[PDB]
């Protein structure tokens, strides 16, 4: 992850004021809706035919909170991004079969949804840094695929 | 393949951006040049220092066309036709760098329209710029 | 699109494959599987090893649709239409995954046919699958 | 590079069957050929009218052997690519501005040559050897771009 100290901090900075809670399940509720292939991962969530349905969904908002969460425990190991996600790799190959082609469509929609909470904020060279900050998180989560 | 829904969405989100298609167009422009620098070497005789007056100059003119492809949207393969001459014949653009520039078109148009940018016209509007993709990287052989 | 000479390169080419056909889709498959292990988490359910019966059996399924598309070379999109439906409803395969399917299948094409694969015949391959991975994709959303 | 032993032998042992002289050339027309956008960069060699006119250039057979000389060199150092590339890398970026994608091309070309001149010996398991490194040397090539 060549992350500038300057990058580092950019990323950081912002993440702090974010609401985990909304942020986490609006993400996943524009992955499922925008990109509606996704939805066969999770058919046991329920009705997930419209985006009204897809963003009011609980089990969606649930999870959505989780994922967040484990990126966030990954912010704090920037510089190792891929021992703290080993075993997520595993999980999402080994037993839920997860193209990773869907990890970069998920940090593509969560880097859209932040600049929708901080408008103005969310300035190009802080995006650049989260640009580079999803892509170092999906391709760990991809590091351990065979 | 657009919907009724999907057309009406996005005449309506870019209705919103009205008069400052050029600001956004140059802005996405800008986000592009930075997250991507890749697509840098496709404008190697750009001044593409913050503010320059050739990113926005530019920025206008791929909101025109937007505009005039909103405008035209259930005949864009007709109302782009020359871009798409132009993009495949001349600029040899490889078709990559389309979905980077869609992107963060998204992203401007999530960070200036907060109350338009809902889910489902989220969704819209990445099938409307796809769209406008497809027919510019349509010519190419 | 398909210009005339393309669809006389690709018949001919294809033509050559003749009964090997299913053969050529199963090394394909294979050669996918080892190549892009990523592509395997679609095919959980089936036995991925060296001569697999059920990847022989698929190889033969996936040939025979190519073929198909040859022999309807100017109405692909409406011979290949329940494909289409099956892996944008069903399966629901990400498009990236295509074009190294199609990778695949030109090494393939390559190693059993020297004395047909041209430049111009292997500009025309490339094509046809292009084209043949546009249509199955094209109902996505 | 997760490069195994076998894959550096599988790698190795069947490079050194190759005519460079001849292979870069094939892979360097070829390119030219299936993917004539590229052209815009070699305006300066003349005939590209068609794959013959391509496949015939001087320029280009020339050409060809000058790239796949590198390409060699990289073989010869499959644990310090971005080392061997980085001269080349800054080349490509700050005086002929070169997508890095038409990087990705080449080598999946040279993967299509390889194939064709092998037949059989150009196995499913060698070739994903090759797929590796060709990917090896793209990113290589890509990273001083800024
Ligand atoms: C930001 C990238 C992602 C992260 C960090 C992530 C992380 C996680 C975590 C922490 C779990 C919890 C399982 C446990 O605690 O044992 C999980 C489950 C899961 N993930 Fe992801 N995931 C990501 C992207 C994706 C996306 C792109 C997909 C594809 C749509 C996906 C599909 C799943 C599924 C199906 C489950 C299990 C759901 C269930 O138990 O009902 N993940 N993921
Ligand atoms: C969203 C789809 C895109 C649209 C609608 C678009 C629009 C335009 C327009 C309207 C022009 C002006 C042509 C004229 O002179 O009238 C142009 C030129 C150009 N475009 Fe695109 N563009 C798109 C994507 C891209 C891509 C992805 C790139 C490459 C990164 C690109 C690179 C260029 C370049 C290098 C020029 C030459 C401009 C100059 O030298 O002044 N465009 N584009
Ligand atoms: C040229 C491109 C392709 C063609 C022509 C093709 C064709 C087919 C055909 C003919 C079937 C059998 C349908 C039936 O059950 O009646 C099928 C099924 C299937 N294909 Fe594709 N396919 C292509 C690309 C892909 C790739 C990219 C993927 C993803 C890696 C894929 C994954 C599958 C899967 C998982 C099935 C269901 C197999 C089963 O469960 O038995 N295909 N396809
Ligand atoms: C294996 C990947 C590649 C390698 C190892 C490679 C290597 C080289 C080398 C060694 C040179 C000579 C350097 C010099 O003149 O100082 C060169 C020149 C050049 N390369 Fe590449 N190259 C690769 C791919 C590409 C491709 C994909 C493109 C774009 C289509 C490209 C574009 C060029 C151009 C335009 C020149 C200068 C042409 C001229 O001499 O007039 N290279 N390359």
């Known amino acids: ?146 | 393949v657009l919907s009724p829904a999907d057309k009406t969405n996005v005449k309506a989100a870019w209705g919103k951006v009205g008069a400052h298609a050029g600001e956004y167009g140059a802005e996405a422009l800008e986000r592009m040049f930075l997250s991507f620098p890749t697509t840098k070497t496709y404008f190697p005789h750009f001044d593409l220092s913050h503010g320059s007056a050739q990113v926005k100059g530019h920025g206008k003119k791929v909101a025109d066309a937007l505009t005039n492809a909103v405008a035209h949207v259930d005949d864009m393969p007709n109302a782009l036709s020359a871009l798409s001459d132009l993009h495949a014949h001349k600029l040899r653009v490889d078709p990559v760098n389309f979905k980077l520039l869609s992107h963060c078109l998204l992203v401007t148009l999530a960070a200036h329209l907060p109350a338009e940018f809902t889910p489902a016209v989220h969704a819209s509007l990445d099938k409307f710029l796809a769209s406008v993709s497809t027919v510019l990287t349509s010519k190419y052989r």
């Open chain 1, 1 to 146: 992850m060549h992350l500038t100290p300057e990058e580092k901090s950019a990323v950081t900075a912002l993440w702090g004021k974010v609401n985990v809670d909304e942020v986490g399940g609006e993400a996943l509720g524009r992955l499922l809706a925008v990109y509606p292939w996704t939805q066969r991962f999770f058919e046991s969530f329920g009705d997930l035919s419209t985006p009204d349905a897809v963003m009011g969904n609980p089990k969606v908002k649930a999870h959505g909170k989780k994922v967040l969460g484990a990126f966030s425990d990954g912010l704090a190991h920037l510089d190792n991004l891929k021992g703290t996600f080993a075993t997520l790799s595993e999980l999402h190959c080994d037993k839920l079969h997860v193209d990773p082609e869907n990890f970069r469509l998920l940090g593509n929609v969560l880097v859209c949804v932040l600049a929708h909470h901080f408008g103005k904020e969310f300035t190009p060279p802080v995006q650049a840094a989260y640009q580079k900050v999803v892509a170092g998180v999906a391709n760990a989560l991809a590091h351990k695929y065979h």
